[PDB]
Amino acid sequence: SMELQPQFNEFLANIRPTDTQKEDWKSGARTLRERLKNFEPLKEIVVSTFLQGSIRRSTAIRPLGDKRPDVDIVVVTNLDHTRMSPTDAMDLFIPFLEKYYPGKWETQGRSFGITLSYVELDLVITAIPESGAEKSHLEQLYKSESVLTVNSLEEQTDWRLNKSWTPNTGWVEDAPASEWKAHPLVLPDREKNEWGRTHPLAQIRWTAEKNRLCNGHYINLVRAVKWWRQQNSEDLPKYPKGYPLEHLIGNALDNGTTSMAQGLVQLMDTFLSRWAAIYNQKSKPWLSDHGVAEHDVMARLTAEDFCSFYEGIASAAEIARNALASEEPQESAQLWRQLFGSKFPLP
Numbered sequence: 645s646m647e648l649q650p651q652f653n654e655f656l657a658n659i660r661p662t663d664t665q666k667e668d669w670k671s672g673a674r675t676l677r678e679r680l681k682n683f684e685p686l687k688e689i690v691v692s693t694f695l696q697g698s699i700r701r702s703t704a705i706r707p708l709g710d711k712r713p714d715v716d717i718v719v720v721t722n723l724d725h726t727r728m729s730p731t732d733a734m735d736l737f738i739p740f741l742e743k744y745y746p747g748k749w750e751t752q753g754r755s756f757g758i759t760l761s762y763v764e765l766d767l768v769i770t771a772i773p774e775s776g777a778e779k780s781h782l783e784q785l786y787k788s789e790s791v792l793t794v795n796s797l798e799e800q801t802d803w804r805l806n807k808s809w810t811p812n813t814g815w816v817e818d819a820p821a822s823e824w825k826a827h828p829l830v831l832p833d834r835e836k837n838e839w840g841r842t843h844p845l846a847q848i849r850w851t852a853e854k855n856r857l858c859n860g861h862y863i864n865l866v867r868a869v870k871w872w873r874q875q876n877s878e879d880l881p882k883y884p885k886g887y888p889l890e891h892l893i894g895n896a897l898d899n900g901t902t903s904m905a906q907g908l909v910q911l912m913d914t915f916l917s918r919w920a921a922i923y924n925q926k927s928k929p930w931l932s933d934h935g936v937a938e939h940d941v942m943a944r945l946t947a948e949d950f951c952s953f954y955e956g957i958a959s960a961a962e963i964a965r966n967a968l969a970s971e972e973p974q975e976s977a978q979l980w981r982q983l984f985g986s987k988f989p990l991p
């Protein structure tokens with residue numbers, strides 16, 4: 645078998661967001677947090693502002709050309725979601741946005757977009773559904789370094805969801821589930837002025853654990869498959885992409901991964917075998933979200949798109965198998981380049 649580890653490392657470096665982008669979202673997120681914390685009308689309402697999404701989980705890929713990466717941010721408030729609607733909560737942030745980001749922000753349904761120099765923030769306003777002392781204890785978690793760090797999982801592979809965790813200087817386990825697992829936040833629905841549930845911290849925690857169980861290869865494999873999808877967009881369905889695609893990859897990948905090349909072939913093979921019956925039925929899987937267990941991550945994916953995507957994976961898997969089985973490094977790399985394009989280097 646052929647692993648081409650140095651070529652995969654260079655490929656991954658080429659598809660991660662750039663260091664200029666990274667520094668822009670780190671300063672952008674922290675600056676937003678500090679501005680909200682000191683904005684008098686919101687000082688008693690905002691509990692926490694934290695980095696989330698693929699940027700936080702180190703599963704984001706570099707956008708093409710001059711396009712700005714999407715950087716997801718949660719604002720946690722102490723508002724009572726049974727007495728205030730999502731728009732009531734969002735209404736409060738307009739004067740803040742006009743003061744600090746004039747001409748640079750836009751409402752996009754359930755979120756606010758903010759254009760920075762090199763990145764685009766995607767801000768969602770949330771609330772803690774619990775009340776009283778139970779709310780207070782959850783607020784302590786959202787105020788902890790575990791939550792407030794602006795470093796991503798790749799930079800803190802030991803990260804744990806625990807108010808007592810502190811960053812490793814280079815020189816603690818997850819908190820018991822009883823303290824966080826059954827406690828999602830509420831956020832605005834995509835389309836309706838109604839609250840839904842989301843648990844980004846639980847998704848981050850699951851990703852961190854899966855990455856440790858996969859010897860650091862999981863988050864890199866998500867990026868690689870996302871890159872394949874982007875490079876082959878014209879031959880693939882529009883969906884899955886984004887988080888549902890990441891979730892499918894985390895499902896398909898087995899624990900114990902030892903290399904990128906082996907992991908790609910394993911996860912594609914497992915995808916094809918696991919979903920063979922569903923594909924034969926022209927259906928799609930129902931997959932429990934790692935954050936809100938009762939939610940189907942695939943709820944908006946059509947069966948037609950799932951089955952078209954299955955066919956795309958089938959084609960990719962044949963190439964990936966041949967690359968791993970190749971005896972000549974140049975042939976192997978040329979096969980990976982059929983999936984990934986020119987950002988995967990020849991040896």
Ligand SMILES: Nc1ncnc2c1ncn2[C@@H]1O[C@H](COP(=O)(O)OP(=O)(O)OP(=O)(O)O)[C@@H](O)[C@H]1O
Nearest residue numbers: 697698699704705714716844847886887888933941
């Ligand atoms: N279908 C879904 N199920 C569960 N969580 C979701 C789903 N769609 C979005 N999310 C949550 O909202 C976050 C922001 O969504 P977004 O579309 O920006 O995805 P992403 O994972 O950041 O990927 P991208 O790199 O494409 O932005 C996700 O990271 C995830 O936590």
Ligand SMILES: Nc1ncnc2c1ncn2[C@@H]1O[C@H](COP(=O)(O)OP(=O)(O)OP(=O)(O)O)[C@@H](O)[C@H]1O
Nearest residue numbers: 716768832833834835840841842843844936943944
């Ligand atoms: N920007 C976001 N940040 C955090 N979580 C998100 C975000 N966008 C979506 N989610 C999560 O993804 C789930 C699915 O969101 P999606 O936009 O696909 O449909 P929805 O109609 O809002 O979901 P539902 O009505 O099923 O709650 C949400 O319930 C929430 O848990």
Ligand SMILES: [Mg+2]
Nearest residue numbers: 697698714716
């Ligand atoms: Mg995102």
Ligand SMILES: [Mg+2]
Nearest residue numbers: 697714716766
């Ligand atoms: Mg987003």
Ligand SMILES: [Mg+2]
Nearest residue numbers: 833834835840
């Ligand atoms: Mg909905």
Ligand SMILES: [Mg+2]
Nearest residue numbers: 895896897898
């Ligand atoms: Mg699995």
